[PDB]
Structure formats: C-alpha cells, structure tokens
Design an enzyme around this catalytic site. Structure first.
Site, PDB file in Angstrom:
ATOM      1  N   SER A 296       0.876  -1.211  -0.146  1.00 39.25           N
ATOM      2  CA  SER A 296       0.053  -0.049  -0.070  1.00 39.25           C
ATOM      3  C   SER A 296       0.868   1.187  -0.130  1.00 39.25           C
ATOM      4  O   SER A 296       0.454   2.361   0.061  1.00 39.25           O
ATOM      5  CB  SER A 296      -1.120   0.149   1.136  1.00 39.25           C
ATOM      6  OG  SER A 296      -1.899  -1.218   1.238  1.00 39.25           O
TER       7      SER A 296
ATOM      8  N   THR B  73       0.988   3.692   5.511  1.00 38.24           N
ATOM      9  CA  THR B  73       1.367   2.189   5.913  1.00 38.24           C
ATOM     10  C   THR B  73       1.365   1.510   4.842  1.00 38.24           C
ATOM     11  O   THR B  73       0.701   1.636   3.796  1.00 38.24           O
ATOM     12  CB  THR B  73       0.505   1.709   7.006  1.00 38.24           C
ATOM     13  OG1 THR B  73      -0.987   2.034   6.549  1.00 38.24           O
ATOM     14  CG2 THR B  73       0.558   2.761   8.314  1.00 38.24           C
TER      15      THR B  73
ATOM     16  N   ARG C 231       4.689  -1.334  12.994  1.00 36.88           N
ATOM     17  CA  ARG C 231       5.020  -0.495  11.933  1.00 36.88           C
ATOM     18  C   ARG C 231       5.000   1.029  12.543  1.00 36.88           C
ATOM     19  O   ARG C 231       5.756   1.840  11.809  1.00 36.88           O
ATOM     20  CB  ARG C 231       3.998  -0.429  10.933  1.00 36.88           C
ATOM     21  CG  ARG C 231       3.936  -1.715  10.388  1.00 36.88           C
ATOM     22  CD  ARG C 231       2.692  -1.925   9.493  1.00 36.88           C
ATOM     23  NE  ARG C 231       1.296  -1.418   9.887  1.00 36.88           N
ATOM     24  CZ  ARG C 231       0.236  -1.568   8.984  1.00 36.88           C
ATOM     25  NH1 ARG C 231       0.427  -1.541   7.699  1.00 36.88           N
ATOM     26  NH2 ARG C 231      -0.973  -1.084   9.654  1.00 36.88           N
TER      27      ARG C 231
ATOM     28  N   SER D 220      -6.480   2.978   2.705  1.00 36.88           N
ATOM     29  CA  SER D 220      -5.833   1.820   1.927  1.00 36.88           C
ATOM     30  C   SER D 220      -6.761   1.130   0.890  1.00 36.88           C
ATOM     31  O   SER D 220      -6.699  -0.115   0.936  1.00 36.88           O
ATOM     32  CB  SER D 220      -5.181   0.998   2.754  1.00 36.88           C
ATOM     33  OG  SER D 220      -3.707   1.381   2.663  1.00 36.88           O
TER      34      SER D 220
END
Ligand SMILES: *C(=O)[C@@H]([C@@H]1N=C(C(=O)O)[C@@H](S[C@@H]2CN[C@H](C(=O)Nc3cccc(C(=O)O)c3)C2)[C@@H]1C)[C@@H](C)O
EC number: 3.5.2.6
Lengths: 243, 242
Positions: free
Chosen positions: A47, A186, A227, A95
């Site tokens: 993504s 992300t 993350r 996303s």
C-alpha cells in the site's frame, strides 16, 4: 554515507521482530539505520505504492483533480471500510486497494513503466499484471529508495507538476500541530513471503525535516501496530518527538 | 438564502457569549447561522488576515515558496512563541504577526489594495498603515464573507495560481483524523472594542465539505477558548466533526 546505529536494534528485539528503520535529517545525505544491509534490501511496496500511483493518476489525468470522488459500484469489496464513496485522501487513508487498481488499469503498463523510471522507483518491475504488481507481483523497493523518493516529493522535485505533488502531500498528512507536521503511509504486503509491513513518511518539526522508512517481516495482522511504535520509539530516542 | 437556526443560541448562553456561527454544506449557497444580522456584520479580521496575506505574498513573489524559512533576527518580539525561525505554516499557525507585517510592507499598498478587490475581501479598506490595517485599522469582514473567500480557496477559484492556493491550504491543516480533515485559522483582534475572536475554516468528512466562520466578542482573555469550543460543539452535534 548512511551510518549504522546498532542500539536501535533493541526496539526490534523488544518486540520479537526482524526489520529496518532508516531516518535522515534534512536530506537523504545524512541517514542512519539499525541494519545497513536490510536498509538497501528491496521489498514489495504493497500500500505504500498508493503514493506514486496517486501522483501518476493525477499526472495522466486519470484522477481528474484533488476533488475527484471514487464512487463505489455497490459490488462487494474485501473490507467493509472500502464499501463507500471515497475522496483521494479517504482512499489513501483506508488503503482502498480497488480504487487504486482501477487507477492503475486506466494508467496502463506503458505509462506506469515510464513514471516508475522517472521516479527511480525501486527495481521498476511492474510485471504480475497491471493491477497486482505492487501487491503480489515483482515490484520491490528498499527503505533507502523510499526515503529518496519521499524527499523528492517533499521538495516537489518528482517529474510531475508541483500542483499534483501538493495535492498528494495534503492527502498524506497524518498528524498536525502548529510546528509539527507528519506525512506518512502504511503498508502490509500479504502477497509475498515473508509478508512485509511498512511505514514511510517525513516529519516537519519547527524548521527541520526528517525522512523515514520502516519495514519488518509480519507473521500476520497482530504485529501491524509495530510499524508505527518501533519508528516512534527510535524517533523519540533521537529527540524528534518531544522537546 | 442563508437560514437562521435559533437553536444554536443555546451553545452561546451558558457563557453569555455574543457571537455568530455561519456553517454551509458543499457551497456558500447552502448556509445557516444563529444570527442573520451578525452573520453579515463586518469585524476586524486580525490574524485571520494571514490567509489572504500569505496567498498575496506568494502570488507577488514576496514569499519565495512553501519552504521559505522566516528567520528571527534575535530582536525581542511581542510573544516568546514568535522568537524563533518559522516556516510559512509555522508562521501562520502560531500567528507570528511581525512576519506578516514584513510581508505586507513588501507587498505594498497598491498591490495589497488590488488583491483585496480581486478576492472580494470585506470592506477592502487598508487605511491605517500597510503593516497594521488588519490589526487596528479599518479593514472589516463578515462571517459570511469569510466563508465565501474560504470556499473560493478550497476550490482553487481565487485569482491566484492553483499552486499558491494549494500551498496555503496545506499551511491551514489543523486537525488530521482518519475520518475527517480540518483546515482552520483563529484570530483575536485586541485592537478594536469590543475585542473580536474568530475561528474560520472548513471540514472535509466522507465525501462532503462544510465551510464555517465563527466570531464573538471577547469580554476577557479567559473566554478565548470559546472561539473554538462553541463552533466545535455545534459541528460535533451535526456530525461534521467526529
Ligand atoms: C496496503 O498495504 C494494504 C492494506 N493495508 C492495510 C493495513 O495497513 O492494515 C489493510 S487496509 C487498512 C487497515 N486499517 C485501515 C483502516 O481501516 N483505517 C481507517 C482510516 C480512516 C478511516 C476509516 C474508517 O472511516 O473506517 C478507517 C485500512 C490492507 C491489507 C493493501 C495492499 O491491501
């Protein structure tokens, strides 16, 4: 000239994961990482590819302008958060892969190839089908290359209009305070083994700027918050987050 | 036609606030307000003038670009928060008046006058000196007019490049949430009586956009947060923010 900071490794071992953080102050000419090798290793972008895809979508006119609404056709989608009309910012925030696969389809292979070359985007390998190459295809990009690409974006130096670069920058804003602005994106690439999790972006703090790119091997969904938390702890240790 | 919504007065009442909120969905052709008379009344813009001033500065070349750093010369300023180097977004968000005074001087009277005519900005009165007209001079703008100007900005429809409009737009981002995005600017006009407090901007949620402008009399400095809290409560109650 990237330097290695081995103490940063403690933030990865504390969470039982493998991965890399790259962090540059001012420019991509002053960078540090926990792992020099992995900093340059290329991984499926997943993504995070919405950033080039969006710019390319605008440059080619596939995305008409910043106010474009991506209408949902009502047919079912892989997540419920995607089952709705979306703005460009909305599609990036959730996303929404289907929105971007339609963008990629209308851009087409020859133009997508041309842009990834202009953008020096990783191994520039877009085989695996025009709407799948960044999801399960052969595209790969390193943390270092992510930082270089995002620096060019911040500077409006990509081969795209300033206007389009600005539109995508606004869409990427994820934190805002008077003298602290974060643009970030992300990714979670399930179509490769091991799976990859990404967080890439840049921090404008007072008059300074920091570019960053993180990735890690992800077993499954439960480790996804790392993350952000691992980068956050490193940037905290560097004095970036606080005062 | 803008509609009156008396209900909203309830949010003004506990704090005894004399003020107006103007809130429009999609366009300035679909607006409501708590007070039709006050909606159209013109007040000193104070720091809200940094929005047209930034755009004018960019359009003239006075401001180099997005990445220009405004250096502090080390000489004391009226607020400690201003005693540092600032980016354009920083200078706007901390309301660094001296930076914008310098920009206005370099813009100059003739150009400033013409751009306020192009932007249809309030009474377009810039008398009082080039570096104080929006602080203590005679410039005045209504909440309805703030909304019309912000809508034009949103749509890149001001007489300025799309690029310069986009630069200022990112500079105005104040809240970035997963579900919605807020562009806004506060103001506190101490150079008039009564003192005026402003919050103006727009909110994007789902696929919709809402423009807003709020002003109120500031009876004292402790009432200042009401300039955001009253309009936030109203927009929260309508679902616009949250
Ligand atoms: C991209 O790599 C990939 C995405 N990435 C994902 C991930 O990071 O988990 C999922 S979709 C992702 C999961 N959380 C967000 C989300 O739902 N957040 C959000 C943000 C704003 C608003 C809302 C809302 O209003 O509901 C929700 C989206 C997926 C596997 C592609 C390639 O599949």
């Amino acid at each position: 000239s990237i330097t290695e900071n081995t103490s940063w490794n403690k933030e990865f071992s504390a969470e039982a994961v493998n991965g890399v953080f790259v962090l540059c102050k001012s420019s991509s000419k002053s960078c540090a990482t926990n792992d020099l090798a992995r900093a340059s290793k290329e991984y499926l972008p997943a993504s995070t590819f919405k950033i080039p895809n969006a710019i390319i979508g605008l440059e080619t006119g596939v995305i008409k302008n910043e106010h474009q609404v991506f209408k949902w056709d009502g047919k079912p989608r892989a997540m419920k958060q995607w089952e709705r009309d979306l703005t460009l910012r909305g599609a990036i925030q959730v996303s929404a892969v289907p929105v971007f696969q339609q963008i990629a389809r209308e851009v087409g292979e020859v133009r997508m190839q041309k842009y990834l070359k202009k953008f020096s985007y990783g191994n520039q390998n877009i085989s695996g089908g025009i709407d799948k190459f960044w999801l399960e295809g052969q595209l790969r990009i390193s943390a270092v290359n992510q930082v270089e690409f995002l620096e060019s974006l911040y500077l409006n130096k990509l081969s795209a209009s300033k206007e389009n670069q600005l539109i995508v920058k606004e869409a990427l804003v994820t934190e805002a305070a008077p003298e602290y602005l974060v643009h970030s994106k992300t990714g979670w690439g399930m179509g490769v083994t091991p799976q990859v999790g990404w967080w890439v972006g840049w921090v404008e703090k007072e008059t300074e700027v920091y570019f960053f790119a993180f990735n890690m091997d992800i077993d499954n969904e439960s480790k996804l918050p790392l993350r952000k938390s691992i980068p956050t702890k490193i940037m905290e240790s560097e004095g970036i987050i606080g005062g």
